[PDB]
Design an enzyme around this catalytic site. Sequence first.
Site, PDB file in Angstrom:
ATOM      1  N   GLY A   1       0.804  -1.204   0.000  1.00 45.50           N
ATOM      2  CA  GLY A   1       0.000   0.000   0.000  1.00 45.50           C
ATOM      3  C   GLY A   1       0.841   1.260   0.000  1.00 45.50           C
TER       4      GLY A   1
ATOM      5  N   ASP B   1      -7.509  -0.102  -0.261  1.00 45.42           N
ATOM      6  CA  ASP B   1      -7.889   1.271   0.040  1.00 45.42           C
ATOM      7  C   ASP B   1      -7.912   2.139  -1.210  1.00 45.42           C
ATOM      8  OD1 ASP B   1      -6.263  -0.132   2.188  1.00 45.42           O
ATOM      9  OD2 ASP B   1      -7.210   1.439   3.394  1.00 45.42           O
TER      10      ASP B   1
ATOM     11  N   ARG C   1     -10.948   3.344   6.165  1.00 43.21           N
ATOM     12  CA  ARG C   1     -10.664   4.264   7.261  1.00 43.21           C
ATOM     13  C   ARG C   1     -10.018   5.545   6.753  1.00 43.21           C
ATOM     14  NH1 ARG C   1     -10.880   5.355  12.123  1.00 43.21           N
ATOM     15  NH2 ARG C   1     -12.120   3.462  12.460  1.00 43.21           N
TER      16      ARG C   1
ATOM     17  N   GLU D   1     -15.611   3.381   7.490  1.00 45.66           N
ATOM     18  CA  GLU D   1     -15.013   3.423   8.824  1.00 45.66           C
ATOM     19  C   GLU D   1     -14.527   4.821   9.166  1.00 45.66           C
ATOM     20  OE1 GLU D   1     -11.922   0.371   9.223  1.00 45.66           O
ATOM     21  OE2 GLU D   1     -12.916  -0.214  11.089  1.00 45.66           O
TER      22      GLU D   1
ATOM     23  N   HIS E   1     -12.597  -8.334   8.239  1.00 38.46           N
ATOM     24  CA  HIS E   1     -11.606  -9.053   7.437  1.00 38.46           C
ATOM     25  C   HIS E   1     -12.157  -9.613   6.128  1.00 38.46           C
ATOM     26  CE1 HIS E   1      -9.022  -9.939  11.237  1.00 38.46           C
ATOM     27  NE2 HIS E   1      -8.406  -9.027  10.506  1.00 38.46           N
ATOM     28  N   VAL E   2     -13.484  -9.680   5.965  1.00 43.49           N
ATOM     29  CA  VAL E   2     -14.084 -10.296   4.782  1.00 43.49           C
ATOM     30  C   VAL E   2     -13.653  -9.588   3.503  1.00 43.49           C
ATOM     31  CG1 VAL E   2     -16.294 -10.845   3.644  1.00 43.49           C
ATOM     32  CG2 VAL E   2     -16.038 -11.167   6.112  1.00 43.49           C
TER      33      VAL E   2
ATOM     34  N   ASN F   1     -16.774  -9.544 -26.099  1.00 39.02           N
ATOM     35  CA  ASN F   1     -15.876  -8.397 -26.244  1.00 39.02           C
ATOM     36  C   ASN F   1     -15.389  -8.246 -27.684  1.00 39.02           C
ATOM     37  OD1 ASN F   1     -14.554  -6.096 -25.310  1.00 39.02           O
ATOM     38  ND2 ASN F   1     -12.735  -7.217 -24.641  1.00 39.02           N
TER      39      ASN F   1
ATOM     40  N   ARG G   1     -10.012 -34.932 -19.568  1.00 36.47           N
ATOM     41  CA  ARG G   1     -11.449 -34.729 -19.464  1.00 36.47           C
ATOM     42  C   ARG G   1     -11.836 -33.453 -20.195  1.00 36.47           C
ATOM     43  NH1 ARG G   1     -11.231 -39.088 -18.424  1.00 36.47           N
ATOM     44  NH2 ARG G   1     -12.172 -40.350 -16.764  1.00 36.47           N
TER      45      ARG G   1
ATOM     46  N   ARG H   1     -17.323 -11.051 -37.301  1.00 39.05           N
ATOM     47  CA  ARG H   1     -17.995 -10.195 -36.322  1.00 39.05           C
ATOM     48  C   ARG H   1     -17.054  -9.812 -35.182  1.00 39.05           C
ATOM     49  NH1 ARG H   1     -22.508 -10.733 -33.552  1.00 39.05           N
ATOM     50  NH2 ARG H   1     -21.805 -12.803 -32.897  1.00 39.05           N
TER      51      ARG H   1
HETATM   52  N1  LIG Z   1       7.148   6.623   6.171  1.00 37.24           N
HETATM   53  C1  LIG Z   1       7.579   5.239   6.250  1.00 37.24           C
HETATM   54  N2  LIG Z   1       8.843   4.919   6.305  1.00 37.24           N
HETATM   55  C2  LIG Z   1       9.316   3.713   6.376  1.00 37.24           C
HETATM   56  N3  LIG Z   1       8.584   2.626   6.401  1.00 37.24           N
HETATM   57  C3  LIG Z   1       7.273   2.885   6.346  1.00 37.24           C
HETATM   58  C4  LIG Z   1       6.659   4.193   6.266  1.00 37.24           C
HETATM   59  N4  LIG Z   1       5.297   3.892   6.235  1.00 37.24           N
HETATM   60  C5  LIG Z   1       4.957   2.599   6.286  1.00 37.24           C
HETATM   61  N5  LIG Z   1       6.199   1.997   6.350  1.00 37.24           N
HETATM   62  C6  LIG Z   1       6.371   0.595   6.417  1.00 37.24           C
HETATM   63  O1  LIG Z   1       5.400  -0.094   5.502  1.00 37.24           O
HETATM   64  C7  LIG Z   1       4.649  -1.035   6.386  1.00 37.24           C
HETATM   65  C8  LIG Z   1       3.213  -1.101   5.999  1.00 37.24           C
HETATM   66  O2  LIG Z   1       2.727   0.185   5.737  1.00 37.24           O
HETATM   67  P1  LIG Z   1       1.161   0.506   6.139  1.00 37.24           P
HETATM   68  O3  LIG Z   1       0.964   0.418   7.582  1.00 37.24           O
HETATM   69  O4  LIG Z   1       0.811   1.902   5.889  1.00 37.24           O
HETATM   70  O5  LIG Z   1       0.148  -0.515   5.338  1.00 37.24           O
HETATM   71  P2  LIG Z   1      -0.312  -0.287   3.774  1.00 37.24           P
HETATM   72  O6  LIG Z   1       0.809  -0.495   2.862  1.00 37.24           O
HETATM   73  O7  LIG Z   1      -0.637   1.112   3.518  1.00 37.24           O
HETATM   74  O8  LIG Z   1      -1.586  -1.266   3.412  1.00 37.24           O
HETATM   75  P3  LIG Z   1      -3.135  -0.901   3.836  1.00 37.24           P
HETATM   76  O9  LIG Z   1      -3.523   0.472   3.531  1.00 37.24           O
HETATM   77  O10 LIG Z   1      -4.148  -1.721   3.179  1.00 37.24           O
HETATM   78  O11 LIG Z   1      -3.413  -1.047   5.263  1.00 37.24           O
HETATM   79  C9  LIG Z   1       4.793  -0.507   7.765  1.00 37.24           C
HETATM   80  O12 LIG Z   1       4.744  -1.583   8.732  1.00 37.24           O
HETATM   81  C10 LIG Z   1       6.106   0.117   7.798  1.00 37.24           C
HETATM   82  O13 LIG Z   1       7.098  -0.872   8.173  1.00 37.24           O
HETATM   83  O1  LIG Z   2     -22.923 -12.878 -30.601  1.00 40.43           O
HETATM   84  P1  LIG Z   2     -22.462 -12.391 -29.305  1.00 40.43           P
HETATM   85  O2  LIG Z   2     -22.664 -10.947 -29.364  1.00 40.43           O
HETATM   86  O3  LIG Z   2     -21.010 -12.538 -29.368  1.00 40.43           O
HETATM   87  O4  LIG Z   2     -23.216 -13.115 -28.028  1.00 40.43           O
HETATM   88  C1  LIG Z   2     -22.503 -13.938 -27.149  1.00 40.43           C
HETATM   89  C2  LIG Z   2     -23.206 -15.253 -27.025  1.00 40.43           C
HETATM   90  O5  LIG Z   2     -23.634 -15.744 -28.338  1.00 40.43           O
HETATM   91  C3  LIG Z   2     -22.972 -17.028 -28.583  1.00 40.43           C
HETATM   92  O6  LIG Z   2     -22.526 -17.089 -29.877  1.00 40.43           O
HETATM   93  C4  LIG Z   2     -23.959 -18.173 -28.321  1.00 40.43           C
HETATM   94  O7  LIG Z   2     -25.261 -17.666 -28.266  1.00 40.43           O
HETATM   95  P2  LIG Z   2     -26.509 -18.741 -28.321  1.00 40.43           P
HETATM   96  O8  LIG Z   2     -26.445 -19.777 -27.294  1.00 40.43           O
HETATM   97  O9  LIG Z   2     -27.827 -18.137 -28.147  1.00 40.43           O
HETATM   98  O10 LIG Z   2     -26.607 -19.481 -29.575  1.00 40.43           O
HETATM   99  C5  LIG Z   2     -21.813 -17.055 -27.642  1.00 40.43           C
HETATM  100  O11 LIG Z   2     -20.688 -16.408 -28.248  1.00 40.43           O
HETATM  101  C6  LIG Z   2     -22.272 -16.283 -26.474  1.00 40.43           C
HETATM  102  O12 LIG Z   2     -22.976 -17.128 -25.561  1.00 40.43           O
HETATM  103 MG   LIG Z   3      -2.386   2.184   3.414  1.00 42.15          MG
END
Ligand SMILES: Nc1ncnc2c1ncn2[C@@H]1O[C@H](COP(=O)(O)OP(=O)(O)OP(=O)(O)O)[C@@H](O)[C@H]1O
Ligand SMILES: O=P(O)(O)OC[C@H]1O[C@](O)(COP(=O)(O)O)[C@@H](O)[C@@H]1O
Ligand SMILES: [Mg+2]
Lengths: 761, 761
Positions: B108, B156, B200, B254, B288-289, B520, B644, B724
Amino acid sequence: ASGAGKAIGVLTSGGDAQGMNAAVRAVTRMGIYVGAKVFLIYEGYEGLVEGGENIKQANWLSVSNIIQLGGTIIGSARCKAFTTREGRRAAAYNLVQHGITNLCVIGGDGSLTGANIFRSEWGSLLEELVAEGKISETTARTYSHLNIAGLVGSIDNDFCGTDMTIGTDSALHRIMEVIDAITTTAQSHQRTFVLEVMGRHCGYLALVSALASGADWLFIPEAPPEDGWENFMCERLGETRSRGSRLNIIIIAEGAIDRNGKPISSSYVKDLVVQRLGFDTRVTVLGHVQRGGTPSAFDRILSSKMGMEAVMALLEATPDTPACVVTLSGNQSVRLPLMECVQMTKEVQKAMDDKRFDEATQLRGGSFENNWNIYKLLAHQKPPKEKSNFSLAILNVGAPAAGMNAAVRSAVRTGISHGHTVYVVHDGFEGLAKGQVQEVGWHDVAGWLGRGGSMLGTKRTLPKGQLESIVENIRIYGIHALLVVGGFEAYEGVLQLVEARGRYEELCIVMCVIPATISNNVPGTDFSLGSDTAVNAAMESCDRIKQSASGTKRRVFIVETMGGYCGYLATVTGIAVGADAAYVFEDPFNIHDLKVNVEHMTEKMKTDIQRGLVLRNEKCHDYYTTEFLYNLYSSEGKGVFDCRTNVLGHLQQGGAPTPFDRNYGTKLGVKAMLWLSEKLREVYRKGRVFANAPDSACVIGLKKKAVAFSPVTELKKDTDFEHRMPREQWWLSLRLMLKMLAQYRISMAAYVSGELEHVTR
Amino acid sequence: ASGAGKAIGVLTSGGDAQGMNAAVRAVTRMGIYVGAKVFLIYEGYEGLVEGGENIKQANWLSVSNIIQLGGTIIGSARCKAFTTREGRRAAAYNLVQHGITNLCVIGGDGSLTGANIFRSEWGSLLEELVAEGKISETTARTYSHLNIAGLVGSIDNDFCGTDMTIGTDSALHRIMEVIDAITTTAQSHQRTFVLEVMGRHCGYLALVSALASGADWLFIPEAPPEDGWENFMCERLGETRSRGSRLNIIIIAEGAIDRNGKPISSSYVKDLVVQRLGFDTRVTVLGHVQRGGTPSAFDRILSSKMGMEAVMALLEATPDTPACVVTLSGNQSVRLPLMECVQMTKEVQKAMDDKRFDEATQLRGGSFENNWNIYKLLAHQKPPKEKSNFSLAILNVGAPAAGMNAAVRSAVRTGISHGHTVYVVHDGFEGLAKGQVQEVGWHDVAGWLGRGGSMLGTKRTLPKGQLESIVENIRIYGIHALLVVGGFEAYEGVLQLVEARGRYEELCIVMCVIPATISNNVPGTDFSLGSDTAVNAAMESCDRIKQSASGTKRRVFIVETMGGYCGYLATVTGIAVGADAAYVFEDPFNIHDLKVNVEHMTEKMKTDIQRGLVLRNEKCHDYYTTEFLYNLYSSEGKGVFDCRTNVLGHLQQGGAPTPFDRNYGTKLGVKAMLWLSEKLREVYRKGRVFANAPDSACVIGLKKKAVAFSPVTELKKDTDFEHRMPREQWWLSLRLMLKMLAQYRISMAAYVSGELEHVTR
Ligand SMILES: Nc1ncnc2c1ncn2[C@@H]1O[C@H](COP(=O)(O)OP(=O)(O)OP(=O)(O)O)[C@@H](O)[C@H]1O
Ligand SMILES: O=P(O)(O)OC[C@H]1O[C@](O)(COP(=O)(O)O)[C@@H](O)[C@@H]1O
Ligand SMILES: [Mg+2]
Ligand SMILES: Nc1ncnc2c1ncn2[C@@H]1O[C@H](COP(=O)(O)OP(=O)(O)OP(=O)(O)O)[C@@H](O)[C@H]1O
Ligand SMILES: Nc1ncnc2c1ncn2[C@@H]1O[C@H](COP(=O)(O)OP(=O)(O)OP(=O)(O)O)[C@@H](O)[C@H]1O
Ligand SMILES: Nc1ncnc2c1ncn2[C@@H]1O[C@H](COP(=O)(O)OP(=O)(O)OP(=O)(O)O)[C@@H](O)[C@H]1O
Ligand SMILES: Nc1ncnc2c1ncn2[C@@H]1O[C@H](COP(=O)(O)OP(=O)(O)OP(=O)(O)O)[C@@H](O)[C@H]1O
Ligand SMILES: Nc1ncnc2c1ncn2[C@@H]1O[C@H](COP(=O)(O)OP(=O)(O)OP(=O)(O)O)[C@@H](O)[C@H]1O
Ligand SMILES: O=P(O)(O)OC[C@H]1O[C@](O)(COP(=O)(O)O)[C@@H](O)[C@@H]1O
Ligand SMILES: [Mg+2]
């Protein structure tokens, strides 16, 4: 590739169509250019029969300084001996004595019929000749096949397979010079001008003359007048008088007949008009005048091109290929078998002999019937009981070009005929912005055919600056279609309007560009309307300039022509006048090329030709100006020749349109209006016109074979906007002919000749 | 080119953002692929300090089968020793003992700040270390420069220079899984769900969660609520009840605070809601999720890409270039100097410490401020006192794609906000032809975010057949803009309607294509809306399949994915799951390549790794079908592994949209409506909308860096209509990463890495 070891005979027969000398010159100078021996047969089939002294081998100087001469230096004669096998065998003998297995015949329909019968019997004649003991069996197995390439040299245009013949244009020049003597004068009193042309068999000259002059009435043998035409004609002239029109023109062909076989004489029509109307009626008969004068520019270029292609077709012709006639249908060179053309001529003659007489005019060719329909439509205002809500504006944009007025006249009449409300805008896009829009009637364009320049104003201003003003005026007047008659600025402006359809709803209107400019720089066409007039004026000045040195004096003239960066006008004028060089932008030249051409001129001026002439396009080179070329040629030619300069400025511009330009602008103006009406019907929807596809804005063509409609957006790829010309121009192959005809050894492998085509039924 | 003779250290520090293992795997495998030695530093800066046993050299199998694991197998620890120079010198010593001049730090903002201070003192630390006598002067002149490439691994997204961080997407997956547990149930009684996220310091997770779930209210530290928010919130929930909406969602970070420093607890908001409203209020705290579970597909691809680009940047880095952070802004990889990012983080922290507090949110990044504005606009209907005569129809065309509904919801709200009369047409072009147009209100799209597929009907039928009906219905309903949310059929249909502007005036309306498809395969974008959902469902099935062998049987699975001819889905899924090979149409393969891959698999399967996985795009080969590959692998693997097959059919299709897809479709739906309104004002003229330029019909992009609007007519060049799909696809470079991670020696000179860019102020 070269035709070495074989000899080419060239002869002229029939009436001496002017421009024959150009064809003979090109045939001779191609034949000795490719190494073939050229033999000049004097007096045509006459000297073919007697032979001996009448058959002479040609050198390069034998056809020197003849291109501007009318008639034929070879001479033509009517001989009855060639009709019979007794004289035809003698003709075959005299050809064999010189090893002439190749014959070019320049003549009318009878000449080419005799040539066809001469090929068809060539094997039998040789057999009977060896049988009688005048040639051994050896020396007869060689020469067993006689190659015939025909050239239609006649003022009649009676040869059915061919659309245009040598001398027709120049005969039309003579005719219209006489008519312009009458029409250009301030018409003071009521008088009737009855012109009698020599179209005894064919009425093509009478027809095109009537179309070009706007004749009130036409007597042609193809379409004799209905019973009671006496009253119908006299009434037409009567309402013509009531209009205030002070001059009536009656074109009566020599072969004028009624529905029976009884001919109608010019004297009869005269006395008829005098008796019922009392107008001062006098009959003008041209007679020999039609065959006289210099050949027109068209005749010189086309005769040179066809004579060259005749020679080339005569060398690539194997024992199996038939006798051909080298001609141009449209702008495209083509070869037609002599047998089929002779057969069609016989069919039309039999049809004209009261067999399928009403249906003989179609077999004459589509051009004849279309010309007669256009003539009758434009002659007299019939009542357009049909009406349409559409309304169209006719613009003239760019420089003035000879023939804009003819196009606008035909457009107005044809649009009124279809019921459209025709407007004309003065000063092109400027007036469209400023609202100088004037509803026009049938008679408002009366007598616009022969007027050069532009009755409507022309402006070079492109529509982009005043685009808001233009769309405002289009909305006010409800302009559903826009006919823009003009040069590169016309095309470019229409292109800007089409591109601006994205922004302005009101510009979703059908547009059409009629290319009309001196430079012939408009993409999408071969001939801009009025380029022919400029070429004719240019050669006339060049012929005058070349005529001015006399006798002993050896002098070169540097002539500067107009045309912008487009070299077309320079090159064709150089061909028509026998110019030594035509420096143009499209063929970049450096000082090495100049020293080559100058030394070439010096060696030429040491020979018996004493008047060199080189053309300079005004924008061919940034530094090698006309003064530069003057200094170069005069210095290097010191002690051999003098040099002089003449910049043909606006001498190429203000002239009245040539007859070609009048007929051309007349026809494509009609066709543009037909296309506009068809596109407007194709595009009308939901109570309004909405022209938004790119094919709804097209340049009317004549691109290779027939009239075309090239969309402006498609032409934009092949358009050099910086130089205001197309990127690929059809005429660059004519440089090869110019250089060949001036002894420049140029490998013309890039030149393409017309291939064989069967007649179009 | 290769980084031979040098060693790379990889460590993880801070909170164990899931997807760290993917980054570590890519770093390790790229490091030993290019010949460098890779050293795994366990417990992060902890093991850096103690060193010794905590620093072990990696082989290819050391990072085997970890890409699907969350957390970090390297382990992370908070150590205060690295804060002080006493421990940092010991860290520099332990790096020098292994010749590790190259360090990759995955952590980060605090981790990267420590890495920045470690580089800045690396020369001074080495000087003091040689001075104290723990390293000789020789062996210290070498290693004089320490190369640092940072990777932002945190939930973040607090690191200001970077737009997206590793683990943010997966933390959002956890959050929305919990929220979907609430919202997808048949909501039976009035209850209030108060979700507390661990943001946060940074409120990005709280914000994007609120946007993705359509939270009624949001407490984020960046924008604390105004004074008297107690009443304002309770009233909002009150009218929410009066609407009949039975569930209110309150997302409280947060770090939620008021305008003063006093924090707002989730328990306080609970008791507040209970007291004034009486709704059943219970606070869900993820804890944490958020850091838990598997990494999402996005996290695996992006972690692998950034880990590879980190290694490559670490080898092409000279003594002069500064410490960098490899990240992606938009879809484009970029490197930002570590110093500038640390400085911006310090500036935003000082600003958030009541210095420029109201103006701290802009320094957080334009994405944050834009996301919060979009959230507030869509949350509560403010009165649009502005009105416009414009009306627009929203189409859903093609297959259903996860996230179409989110786009439609945002489009509806944003269009109503601008005063447009928004219509929704059921069944796309079919209904538009059939007039299934339904005027829509604000609440008609209520709760459309999380619904998969399409609430409006989707049909694939192109508009060309029923074009007269479509224009008739556009005219009847007065539709001025057309928003088409769909796949290649959507783009193609809009292309047909634009091309038909030439014919139909009514189709001169603004059009917009939102690419929404599983495959695409829509040209003009990098991510079609719902491709992310399909990839996530595809890997989850593949992970399930790969886990079914249960660590003992040696088995290869041939898994056939969808995507048509477009191989994007197959290849990215192969990267996400560590597939041995992803056969796709864009990389044609023959039997020689198959034997190479099969022998490669057999050799790999004799080692410790027992679960192979090859993906096949459904239309990659005409003959080498899934059954063909099954027969090949099972035969050649006889006596080594079994084979397979599993054709993932519509398992990849009908899922709810992932949180990325919801936020993405939400945002581009807003942007599409902004662009529609701007283009409609730009194009309204003379009392009507007339949109005819090609730029008035665009596909909303995200093409390289930011959202783009590619005109459909311009995209037609780069579109393979037969298959196409686009002709040039951005993702073909990811094949090289797949193959490299699977031990295929491929010369990846065609891979382009992001160059250095300064922070955008
Ligand atoms: N100014 C700094 N100088 C030196 N080391 C740093 C500095 N800032 C952060 N670090 C180091 O980088 C580590 C992780 O940085 P940080 O706590 O900010 O998490 P992060 O990289 O920003 O990830 P996240 O934002 O998701 O929490 C820190 O534990 C620290 O060791
Ligand atoms: O023609 P497009 O725009 O690429 O549409 C994508 C869908 O059409 C397909 O050709 C298949 O469509 P169908 O099952 O209706 O026959 C696949 O490429 C995809 O599932
Ligand atoms: Mg950070
Ligand atoms: N059927 C024929 N067979 C043989 N020779 C012919 C035939 N017809 C004409 N000729 C020859 O061609 C010569 C000229 O032909 P013709 O009298 O028809 O003039 P032309 O070529 O048609 O020119 P124009 O029409 O202008 O008067 C004739 O003198 C005659 O020798
Ligand atoms: N300018 C003209 N010159 C010569 N003949 C003409 C001219 N105008 C009309 N005619 C002739 O008068 C005849 C009848 O003329 P009109 O146009 O009034 O009736 P029509 O039925 O339309 O004849 P059509 O359409 O076939 O030419 C036509 O056969 C035509 O040949
Ligand atoms: N070259 C010219 N320059 C200027 N005015 C001309 C020229 N030619 C003819 N005009 C004028 O045009 C006027 C219109 O009459 P004109 O004979 O020319 O045509 P029209 O027979 O009446 O009708 P249409 O053009 O259809 O044949 C004439 O009075 C004449 O003054
Ligand atoms: N869905 C929401 N979540 C969180 N706070 C909100 C929400 N809606 C409005 N607020 C907060 O309530 C305060 C006032 O709301 P309101 O939109 O009605 O007036 P406002 O002048 O338009 O405020 P602003 O335009 O700056 O957002 C705002 O400062 C805003 O922070
Ligand atoms: N995955 C789902 N499938 C089907 N219906 C759903 C799903 N999620 C929510 N709903 C329905 O949408 C209805 C509308 O209420 P909901 O909470 O979803 O949106 P809201 O808060 O009222 O407005 P908004 O979408 O702008 O945030 C709910 O009553 C619920 O039945
Ligand atoms: O520009 P365009 O269409 O070629 O017009 C042809 C005329 O314009 C020119 O450029 C000269 O015109 P200006 O005398 O008015 O300047 C020449 O090429 C020619 O006389
Ligand atoms: Mg004749």
